[PDB]
């Protein structure tokens with residue numbers, strides 16, 4: 001009923017959308033992994049009379065449910081998708097997307113890591129993102145590579161028309177007491193990568209984490225704090 005939807009509010013297999021700004025939505029789904037249930041976020045950005053999708057809904061059936069929810073709530077076709085790193089909460093569902101006619105994209109680093117790990121593989125490579133601080137335009141968003149953080153390949157996404165910063169899994173929600181799933185992370189570089197985000201997007205008004213509730217710019221400093229304390 002209007003609040004940001006939480007893990008116990010979304011059965012695994014259902015997807016909810018949340019309006020962030022004009023022409024910007026998050027998508028929220030839940031998935032089981034190693035015997036626990038987790039929420040995750042992605043982004044939808046209006047691209048004229050089409051939509052750009054950022055990240056899958058963490059699985060094939062969730063991603064099919066995402067497409068159905070978009071058709072119900074928005075009614076514009078998803079034509080392109082970008083996955084922000086190689087983990088299943090970002091690429092799981094890419095095969096569903098591709099068979100639905102969506103062109104799928106990721107950095108070459110993400111594509112290599114996904115292939116090596118046995119995850120679904122986006123079709124098209126996003127060049128121009130291999131050095132920290134790199135940025136490229138992609139429809140109505142800017143893609144930014146901040147450096148290694150949650151993963152070595154993690155990208156962030158900025159929507160300039162709305163000053164929305166989608167941090168993906170490099171950014172944690174304010175209630176987080178832990179650095180999340182850090183198995184592929186660089187804890188030493190992560191604060192430096194967050195500092196790059198902070199420097200590049202000082203006008204961000206909404207910050208969306210990979211998992212959990214959106215907030216403001218404080219999510220960035222909070223993330224650096226949590227990662228440093230985890231390493232400590």
Ligand SMILES: C[C@H](OC(=O)c1ccc(CN2C(=O)c3ccccc3C2=O)cc1)c1cccc2c(-c3ccc(CN4CCOCC4)nc3)c(C(=O)O)[nH]c12
Pocket residue numbers: 033038087088089116117118150169172173175176177178179180181182183184210211212
């Ligand atoms: C889907 C994602 O898989 C992973 O990451 C992950 C990593 C490493 C392997 C390990 N491997 C390999 O090397 C390998 C090589 C070859 C073949 C197969 C594999 C393989 O399987 C698996 C999977 C995920 C699965 C399950 C959970 C998560 C979380 C998460 C989010 C939030 C919290 C709770 N907090 C509150 C909010 O703030 C942070 C703390 N806790 C965890 C977050 C995230 O943090 O983004 N990603 C998660």
Ligand SMILES: [Zn+2]
Pocket residue numbers: 085087150151169
């Ligand atoms: Zn991840």
Ligand SMILES: [Zn+2]
Pocket residue numbers: 087089169210211
């Ligand atoms: Zn994640």
